[PDB]
Design a protein around this ligand. Structure first.
Ligand SMILES: Cc1cccc2c(=O)[nH]c(CS[C@H]3CC[C@H](O)CC3)nc12
Length: 180
């Protein structure tokens, strides 16, 4: 009924393409990028920005937003484009640092075939996501919510991973379609 969306392909000549490709290529330059798409979900965006506003108000100097990677299967792409990373989708993720959605600092982490499952045509899907990491601590497998902390990480001093527990904590801004 809501969180309708549009999928807008970036021209390789679009500055936004150059920018996403760069971050991706820090760790995944051995992959070939077929396409980069912007997900335009105004309802999902506005919800994310409301959440951001409240967090920015409470965490003081903290830079609350990171751009992180999320590998998924072709079949979850329409679900994530509409709903973002909601509670039912969290159920589908691993549970190492809690029951939420997992995002990687580095693309190579997400580019694994366990996360970005190659589809029937060998294409893999990694979103480049705005995540409200805010104030985070070390996570563990029992958590259904953060212990509140905004997110949890594998390593507070040197994060590789973040887990978000709340709806509207992440915006799936870009979808990278690639192959081996
Ligand atoms: C646990 C974890 C650690 C690090 C990175 C990721 C990441 O990048 N992606 C994912 C979702 S994996 C996806 C879930 C839906 C299913 O149907 C297809 C597989 N998890 C991650």
């Amino acid at each position: 009924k809501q969180q309708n969306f549009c999928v807008v392909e970036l021209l390789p000549s679009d500055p936004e393409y150059n920018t996403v490709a760069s971050k991706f290529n820090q760790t995944c330059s051995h992959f070939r990028i077929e396409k980069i798409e912007r997900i335009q979900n105004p309802d999902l965006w506005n919800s994310y920005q409301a959440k951001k506003k409240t967090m920015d108000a409470k965490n003081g100097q903290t830079m609350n937003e990171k751009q992180l990677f999320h590998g998924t299967d072709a079949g979850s792409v329409p679900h994530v484009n509409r709903n973002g990373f909601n509670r039912s989708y969290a159920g589908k993720n691993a549970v190492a640092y809690g029951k939420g959605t997992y995002f990687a600092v580095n693309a190579n982490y997400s580019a694994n075939d366990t996360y970005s499952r190659p589809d029937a045509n060998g294409r893999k899907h990694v979103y480049y996501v705005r995540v409200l990491t805010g104030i985070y601590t070390h996570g563990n497998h029992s958590l259904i919510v953060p212990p509140l902390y905004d997110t949890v990480t594998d390593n507070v001093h040197h994060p590789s991973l973040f887990v978000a527990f709340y709806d509207y904590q992440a915006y799936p801004e870009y979808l990278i379609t690639f192959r081996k």
